[PDB]
């Protein structure tokens, strides 16, 4: 978990297809709709042939999320699961002798 968190932080999952839309404004873009940016984006989407989206899924390279000893030490000496042997002494105390 800590290693995948570190890998996510390092990758940062940012800077994807920046500045896709081109600058195409024109002077006569007035005397009508004031949402011309939305219409231009609509057309830029529409000029595409079809939603291919045949992208290579292996580009992520998720296998690189490897652990390190420093990451290993993120255990931070977690609390014990068993409170104390004192609570369990009798367990073997009765079985110092052979079992019944």
């Amino acid at each position: 978990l800590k290693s995948v968190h570190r890998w996510l932080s390092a990758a940062d999952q940012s800077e994807v297809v920046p500045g896709n839309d081109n600058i195409e404004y024109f002077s006569i873009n007035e005397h009508g709709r004031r949402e011309e940016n939305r219409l231009r984006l609509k057309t830029l989407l529409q000029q595409d042939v079809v939603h291919e989206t045949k992208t290579s899924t292996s580009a992520a390279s998720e296998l690189t999320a490897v652990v390190t000893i420093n990451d290993l030490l993120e255990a931070c000496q977690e609390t014990k699961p068993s409170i104390s042997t004192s609570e369990l002494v009798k367990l073997r105390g009765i079985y110092d002798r052979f079992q019944k």
């Binding site: 024109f26 002077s27 006569i28 009508g32 709709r33 219409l39 057309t43 529409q46 000029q47």
Partner: protein, 79 residues
């Protein structure tokens, strides 16, 4: 060519006028277009070479203005 075709006139001068039109232009021509100093000059440049006359030219969707260099992408609202 055609042996025959269908034709029918538009009665009562009911000719629609488009509200918006989209154009696709190549790098050189588009740059030459926007380099003009004012809006009126750009409109005149559009008018001249394409022979498009306002309130008298009817244009359609996906019409190629010149072969492989520029095209009208679409029209709205009417085809």
């Amino acid at each position: 060519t055609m042996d025959f075709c269908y034709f029918e006139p538009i009665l009562d001068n009911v000719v629609p006028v488009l509200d918006s039109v989209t154009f696709l232009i190549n790098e050189q021509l588009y740059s030459k277009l926007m380099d003009l100093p004012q809006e009126m000059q750009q409109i005149q440049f559009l008018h001249y070479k394409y022979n498009i006359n306002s309130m008298e030219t009817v244009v359609h969707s996906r019409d190629i203005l010149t072969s492989g260099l520029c095209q009208i992408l679409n029209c709205s609202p009417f085809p």
